């Protein structure tokens, strides 16, 4: 038993991380097959970031301007191209440690593991969620750009995130591996508005189910509610509305605990209106929304890779 | 910026994990050089665990009773011996993926990463602390025994924990890699008392320092206090007393923030007596004690491996 915010094992990704340097900018890159992916702002100076013209800047760079370094093994760039906001550095050597991988664009509310890197070297791994406003609340210092987020399913690494920038508000924004930003942000040093950050209701429900599984049931009540009535209260507390798709996804947790989704909604409703009275659930005094229903099932069944 | 409960990258350890089977018990083992380490209760049945005589049970087992499996590669046991509560299985093949490693016995309040495994396969990685009562609050399902905890310093893996048992209270107990239990527990299925679980005060202080670094400073006040006066209040709230050794360890955080240790103690004192008023610090409504001063420095300076 027990419940922890658990990250995927990072071994398969550690062996894909490289240091990319262009001029005096050094950040992290993702080396898969004979290609290296990295944020395109590696080519900018500090002055450039205020208002970069990436096409103009990229034309004054040649293949030999990019220094890719994998441990003490230098790679040779024999082709470069810009795809959206990522630079694709074609190199002479295919990474022998390339895993079975794919690129996926995740939806808000989904979780993934982040391997924080500096100078192409792993530093730490943590689990986080894509917020509904398409930001993440990570831990990134300068030179972490190029760090990637990922999920593992069986033997296949799903890369879903590349870190690009920290907003003046201290939250983090990045792209998928095709270079398309999550959210309306752009890779330029300017004030950019993130939208309201709402709470991922379906994830809260999965976490409450995890609590019941681990013996925390003080919050249960025999009240019930309707999906419409619940959403009216959820909307007022900046909780994402719940849909029938969310109810379906929680079915397996409903079956294992004998507690209907709408009954659990009624217990959450009470918590929002009356608070936690200084009590806790799974060691937390706040409602947690960084566990998907799949995460809970995964951790309460014992899945390996 | 930002602050996360961050685990070490687990790659170096993933390649050391193997499945050990003896009779009908299968759990995880640690394969380093030509030796496999695993909990000695692998040799027990369910009935045996109530009152095991490990010397008697180990004599009815021979080298060929142990099935060590590393992926699809079977290892051959050519020698076995019991060291305290761990079984050492000497095998014919040295692990080519053996890292630079050492065995260390950690003190309460220190943190380490856990690689949760099942059938010798990694499942997830999380960061936790050794509680002052020598338990850990992990996430373990049956068959996780043999999972290990570890720290990484530069290139060297420090193995510090091997999981053995879940107590009837839902907390977790295990040994160092020499087979000596942390705490007064024994590997037998009986009611065992864990002591009072106190809060790791020095870690709370480091976390509050991390908060100030990341812009959360509402809890600061210009009051001060004495080490003796602080400990009087800490003792009442089941907080570990603070010593001069703890003050010294926090010096570097004191210097970077311009806030004396005793001033920060005064701010914590107020929090214990008056609570958090529903506010939060670094996204938490509770005082966090699973970050050592070294963890905070590591995460706020950008250390790699």
Q: Which domain holds residue B254?
A: 198-301
Q: Provide the angle, in degrees to the nearest 10, between the axes of the packed helices B227-236 and B261-274.
A: 30
A166 shares its domain with A24? no
Indicate whether B153 and B179 sit together in one domain.
Answer: yes
Resolution of this deposited model, Å:
2.0
The whole-angstrom distance between residue B267's C-alpha and the CA centroid of its chain comes to: 29
Distance separating alpha carbons of residues B6 and B278, to the nearest angstrom? 25
Quick check: A7 and B125 CB within 8 A? Answer: yes
CATH number at residue B247: 1.10.1840.10
State how far the Cα of A58 lies from the Cα of A68, in Å rounded to an integer: 17
Alpha carbon separation from A105 to A111, A161, A194, B180, B257 (Å, rounded): 12, 8, 19, 47, 40
Distances in whole angstroms, Cα of residue B73 to Cα of each of A5, A65, B272, B303: 32, 45, 55, 35
H helix runs in chain A, sequence order: 11-14, 54-59, 201-213, 227-236, 244-249, 251-257, 261-274, 293-299
Q: Are B80 and B63 in contact (CB under 8 A)?
A: yes
Residues A123 and A215 in one domain: no
Chain breaks in chain B (C to N over 2.5 A) after: none
* Resolved by: X-ray
Q: H or E segment at B206?
A: helix B201-213
Number of domains in chain B: 3
Interface of A with B in 81-100 (CB under 8 A): none
- Closest CB to A4: pick one of B10, B12, B138: B138
β-sheet bridge partners, residue A163: A174
Q: Measuring CA to CA, which residue among B67, B56, B62, B94 is closest to residue B80? A: B62
Asked which of A176, A197, A218 is the last residue of a domain, the reply is A197
- Concerning whether A41 is annotated as a catalytic residue, the answer is yes
- What six digits make up the tokens of A268? 């959450």
CB contact under 8 A, A284 and B285: yes
Measured distance CA(A152)–CA(A106) in Å, rounded: 13
- A4 and A153 belong to one structural domain: yes
Contacts of B138 in chain A (CB under 8 A): 2, 4
Examine the fold and report which residue of B197, B231, B264 is the final residue of a domain before the chain moves on.
B197
| CATH classification of the domain holding A183 | 2.40.10.10
Active site residue A145: yes
Q: What angle do CA B249, B252, B256 make, to 5 degrees?
A: 150
**How many angstroms separate the CA of residue B160 from the nearest CA in chain A?**
18
Taking the C-alpha atoms of residue A104 and residue A160, their distance in angstroms, rounded to an integer, is: 5
Do residue B214 and residue A116 have CB atoms under 8 angstroms apart? no
CB contacts, 8 Å: B284 with chain A: 285-286
Q: Is residue A56 located within the same domain as residue A2?
A: no
Coil, strand or helix: which one is A162?
strand
Asked if the Cβ–Cβ distance from B172 to A2 is below 8 Å, we say yes
* Dist. CA A162–CA A105, nearest whole Å: 11
Are both B174 and B260 inside the same structural domain? no
d(CA A151, CA A241): 26
A84 C-beta neighbours (distance < 10 Å), count: 12
Q: Are A113 and A148 part of one and the same domain? A: yes
Nearest CA in chain B to A137: B2
Q: A208, A199, A221: which is closest to A300 by C-alpha?
A: A208
CB A118 within 8 A of CB A124: no
Which of B197, B223, B255 is where one domain is finished? Answer: B197
Q: What are phi and psi of A261, to 5 degrees?
A: -60, -45
Q: Which positions ≥6 away from A75 have C-beta within 8 Å?
A: A18, A31, A36, A68, A69, A91, A92, A93
Token pair for residue A10? 């990072």
Please report residues of B whose CB lies closer than 8 A to that of A142. 302
- The Cα of B117 is separated from the nearest Cα of chain A by a number of Å equal to 7
Interface test with B, best of A167, A302, A303, A305 (most B CBs within 10 A): A302
- Whether residues B292 and B249 share a domain: the answer is yes
| Inter-chain CB proximity B7 and A7 less than 8 Å | yes
- Calculate helix-pair angle for A227-236, A261-274, nearest 10 degrees: 30
Query: How far are the Cα atoms of A83, A226, B1, B108 from residue A233, in angstroms, in the given order?
Result: 43, 11, 34, 44
Measured distance CA(B245)–CA(A53) in Å, rounded:
54
Contact A147, A114 (CB under 8 A): yes
The answer to whether residues B143 and B68 touch, using CB atoms and an 8 Å cutoff, is no
- Rounded CA-CA distance A146/A20 in Å is 9
Chain B residues lying within 8 Å of A128, measured CB to CB: 4
**β partners of residue A149:** A114, A161
Measured between beta carbons, which residues in chain B are less than 8 angstroms from residue A137? 2, 283
- Using the Cβ of B279 and the Cβ atoms of chain A, whether some distance falls under 8 Å is answered with no
Residue from the list A11, A285, A299 with its beta carbon closest to the beta carbon of B139:
A299
Residue of A nearest to B137 (CA): A2
Residue with token string 């609050």: B137
Shared domain for A53 and A160, answered yes or no, is no
Looking at the fold, whether A260 and A129 belong to one and the same domain comes out as no
Which residues have CB under 8 Å from A141's CB, separation 6+? A118, B1, B300, B301, B302
Report CA-CA distances (Å) from A97 to A11, A12, A32, B222.
Answer: 10, 8, 8, 55
Residue keyed to tokens 């005589």: B53
* Phi and psi at residue B253, to the nearest 5°: -70, -40
Q: Are residues A107 and A1 in the same domain?
A: yes
Q: Are residues B132 and B281 in the same domain?
A: no
């Amino acid at each position: 038993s027990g419940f922890r915010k658990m990250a995927f094992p990072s071994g398969k990704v550690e062996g894909c991380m490289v240091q990319v340097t262009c001029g005096t900018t050094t950040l992290n890159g993702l080396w898969l097959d004979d290609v290296v992916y990295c944020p395109r702002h590696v080519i900018c100076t500090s002055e450039d970031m205020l208002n970069p013209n990436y096409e103009d800047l990229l034309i004054r760079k040649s293949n030999h301007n990019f220094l890719v370094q994998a441990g003490n093994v230098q790679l040779r760039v024999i082709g470069h191209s810009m795809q959206n906001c990522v630079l694709k550095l074609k190199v002479d050597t295919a990474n022998p440690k390339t895993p079975k991988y794919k690129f996926v664009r995740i939806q808000p509310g989904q979780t993934f593991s982040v391997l924080a890197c500096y100078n192409g070297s792993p530093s730490g791994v943590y689990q986080c969620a894509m917020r509904p406003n398409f930001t993440i609340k990570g831990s990134f210092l300068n030179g972490s750009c190029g760090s990637v987020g990922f999920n593992i399913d069986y033997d296949c690494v799903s890369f879903c995130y590349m870190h690009h920038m920290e907003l003046p508000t201290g939250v983090h924004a990045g792209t998928d591996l095709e270079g398309n930003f999550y959210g309306p942000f752009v890779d330029r040093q300017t004030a950019q508005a993130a939208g309201t950050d709402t709470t991922i209701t379906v994830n809260v429900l999965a976490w409450l189910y995890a609590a019941v599984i681990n013996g925390d049931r003080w919050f249960l009540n025999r009240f019930t509610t309707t999906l419409n009535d619940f959403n009216l209260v959820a909307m007022k507390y900046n909780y994402e509305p719940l849909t029938q798709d969310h109810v379906d996804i929680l079915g397996p947790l409903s079956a294992q605990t004998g507690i209907a989704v709408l009954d659990m909604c009624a217990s959450l409703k009470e918590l929002l209106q009356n608070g936690m009275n200084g009590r806790t659930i799974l060691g937390s005094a706040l409602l947690e929304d960084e566990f998907t229903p799949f995460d809970v099932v995964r951790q309460c069944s014992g899945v390996t890779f």
